[PDB]
Subunit: 325 residues, 3 copies
Amino acid sequence: RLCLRNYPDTTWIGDSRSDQSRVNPQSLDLVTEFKGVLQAKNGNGLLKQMSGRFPSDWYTPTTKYRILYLGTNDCTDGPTDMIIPTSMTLDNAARELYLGACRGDVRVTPTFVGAAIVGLVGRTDAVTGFSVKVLTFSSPTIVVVGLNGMSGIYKVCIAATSGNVGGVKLINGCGYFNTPLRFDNFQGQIYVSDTFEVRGTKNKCVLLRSSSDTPLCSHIMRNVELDEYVDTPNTGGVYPSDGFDSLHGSASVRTFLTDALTCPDIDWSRIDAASCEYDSCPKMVKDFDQTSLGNTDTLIMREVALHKEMISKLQRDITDVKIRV
Amino acid sequence: RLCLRNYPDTTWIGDSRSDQSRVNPQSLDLVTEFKGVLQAKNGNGLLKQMSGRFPSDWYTPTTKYRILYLGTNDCTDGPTDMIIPTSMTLDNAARELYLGACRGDVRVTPTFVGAAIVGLVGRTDAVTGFSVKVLTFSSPTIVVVGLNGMSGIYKVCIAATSGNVGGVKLINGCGYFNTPLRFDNFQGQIYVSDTFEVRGTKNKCVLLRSSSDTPLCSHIMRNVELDEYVDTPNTGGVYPSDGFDSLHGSASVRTFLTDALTCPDIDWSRIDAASCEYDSCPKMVKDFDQTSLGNTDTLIMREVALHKEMISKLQRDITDVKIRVDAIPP
Amino acid sequence: RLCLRNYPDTTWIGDSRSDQSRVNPQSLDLVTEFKGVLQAKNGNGLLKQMSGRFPSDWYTPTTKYRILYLGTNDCTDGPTDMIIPTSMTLDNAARELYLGACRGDVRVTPTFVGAAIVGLVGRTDAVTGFSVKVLTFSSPTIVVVGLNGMSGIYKVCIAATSGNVGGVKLINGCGYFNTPLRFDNFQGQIYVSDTFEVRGTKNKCVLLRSSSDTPLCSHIMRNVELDEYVDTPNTGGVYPSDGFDSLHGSASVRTFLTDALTCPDIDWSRIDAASCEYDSCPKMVKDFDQTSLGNTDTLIMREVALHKEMISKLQRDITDVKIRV
Ligand SMILES: CC(=O)N[C@H]1[C@H]([C@H](O)[C@@H](O)CO)O[C@@](O)(C(=O)O)C[C@@H]1OC(C)=O
Ligand SMILES: CC(=O)N[C@H]1[C@H]([C@H](O)[C@@H](O)CO)O[C@@](O)(C(=O)O)C[C@@H]1OC(C)=O
Ligand SMILES: CC(=O)N[C@H]1[C@H]([C@H](O)[C@@H](O)CO)O[C@@](O)(C(=O)O)C[C@@H]1OC(C)=O
Ligand SMILES: [Mg+2]
Ligand SMILES: [Mg+2]
Ligand SMILES: [Mg+2]
């Protein structure tokens, strides 16, 4: 019997299936109250948070413990999200991001961007199809992103008419980076996301499987390799067909999550973990009920009083007979 | 009897009356130790935090629970804080802010701002009367603030010599916004505050009335409409006259807050709430003291021991009689 | 016997000796699991974090309680870090930083920087010797840093060919500031760190002595003046020689920290403090075992049963004798 830590020192990191504040309840999988901090956004993921579609909805857990139930939306990242030469693979970017949300002491901070000329700051939907901040460079220049010693991941998207990275001609599209970069001969527009900083990694989580309506992309499928992974109800790896639609509201997922979050009388303060098996979880101590012991004392005192009375009467009775003797 | 959650998973969100580390005690209303995180700044409020007067003192709760005791300072926002055309009203901006502090998963982050030409970054007191970061545009241009899809509120203040929003001529002053905006033909200076982001809203709070020495402005008065609102001592709606001055140190408010924060032996870990009525609060389990039960056993044992020998003596006394009677000739 | 708060509402603020996720265990002094949030980074300090060496590793506690075990690395700040005219002294900068980490409601945020002309944003190792974000001004101008009313500390480093502060000629190097500044006639490059904001100061900490392999610099030695200071094992004030090297892994420091973090059955939820002496710490409540009290009742009930039998016989015997008389 799985018991998930349902407690104020825990952050639930989710997508629409957990976005209790903003999603029609029919599409929710998390339908029980979560006593911790809920960070869940319809459409979002640990990669998608860097796209610019949800500019105010970055995940920023600050608690010791986390429970993750997301990933399906990150499967909409594809070849064009790792097409800039020298970008990380999606497999590697996703592994670092899921490690950070699960275990990391994390921050979301502005990413350094600069250049040999002043770039024009604006916003446009021309680079990604939706509105994001960009720098526009009207002549070819050196463009720099990130700083030596950084520890985190940021996303870049370009619409360049010229440029190269270390002599390799750039390709328009996006990439993930966890090191500083330098573009030479760059002209055009550049989008740079904030940095998901991942520093120490001694926080703790459960990673609940997030299933899609088709088999998972490789970079999310690989979350199965993390010690914290826990399976959730699925049909051959695909989201069950017992929900509001093919992707939300699964009756069986709802039951799995509600049961695990409502284990009775667990003293979460006594275990350093984001979950435990019910028989092993520490239990709340209750007030001792002394009613039985008191009833026993009272009954004993009653009978001893009776004996006291009988003894004195037999003493008088013996005296009565000896007087007669 | 009201019990307020006094626990490390709670943030107290306040102004001078709770700013224990920086305000003379004669002016405090929170005069008892708060076991949670204290974020309280003299002169500040959820609107005023966006003004630029207190550039390092934004409210940034990150805990599940909150207790709010502020609002009086937000009544210094007025018509000139909602005068930029298309600005939110103060009623709606404050509603969104107080909801976010109370229930929100919130952040404070830099607000996007850009333009069709490069703006000059500086600081000045010419826009608001005190020093804030501004962009100066010396020729008319397109100015853009915020991004589609954003979820939060930011403040804008302008000192423009030309410009319009959607063809409506700009008016100098400030406004609050929770959507991106675009100014055309803009020349002059623009201040843009950071964004108070409000995302999910499943955190929990109590909202304690913050009274002024005059009747509350409408945008703070409407906080009474929120489920979390709790009245605090006041005289016809105004701060009581039993304090250090007309706005601070009320004896009766102090007693109200101290009493509510010192309920004995509440096990806050067992209730998912920022307050409870005392009789309904879960109580700490304490070690059982068995001394009285042990005393009762010992008292009983002493008397039973006496009985053993009393009985022994009656047995010998009877047997004497039996033996003596047996000798009666038939 | 010292007991340190080992609980999810506590942040451990450390350097390599506590950097469990990134440092070989042989160099750790914190070798036991910490149930709170661990923010510890090799080479770091509350001053060194602002140097530009740690762009993603600023300390950002958000918990009520903290335990600090750092300072040794801050002793490499020296005269060149307080050489810009009107800079704070290192003594005063460190005092404010350690008080803020210990007691503060703190944030790390971008520091305002502006000028009378547009500065060129780039990165360079020319100002500090390693790559950081800078503005370049190729003609003389007014440069402004920070804002009136700010509450925190930031670091500035310059490589200027001209400039003054209030008519005092600038000197190249660094300085710490907790107020806005204005440079006139400035030409060259300027690095400005993020601001370590310190607002209210009602959070609570223990400040564990951090020893170096030589006597502490003045600005860290003075942490002994804080109420929260607690000595850790040392030899004449110097790091003990019983470790992996002269700066890490002390057997006696390890035992000191492990012992203090493993006090049994402390109910930290009942004490508003980052530490307590063992005998005074509140202890976890355990279920009461009533077995001995029940055994006592049974022993009594047995004897009372016997007395009932003996009284009955006494009654029979007195009746018999009376029958005869
Ligand atoms: C680089 C650029 O000129 N972006 C413009 C942008 C773009 O032309 C469209 O493609 C939408 O992307 O549209 C706007 O109407 C907009 O509201 O976002 C104005 C933007 O102007 C500035 C200064 O950012
Ligand atoms: C836009 C502008 O030039 N602002 C200046 C500001 C201004 O004179 C107003 O406050 C008028 O009162 O004052 C300063 O002395 C100041 O210390 O903030 C320097 C500022 O210079 C720069 C480059 O930002
Ligand atoms: C101001 C400047 O020109 N900085 C350059 C920087 C610098 O030359 C020193 O680090 C070498 O001493 O080096 C680079 O190769 C680098 O990869 O960081 C590119 C930087 O370019 C820009 C526009 O920031
Ligand atoms: Mg495994
Ligand atoms: Mg109501
Ligand atoms: Mg008994």
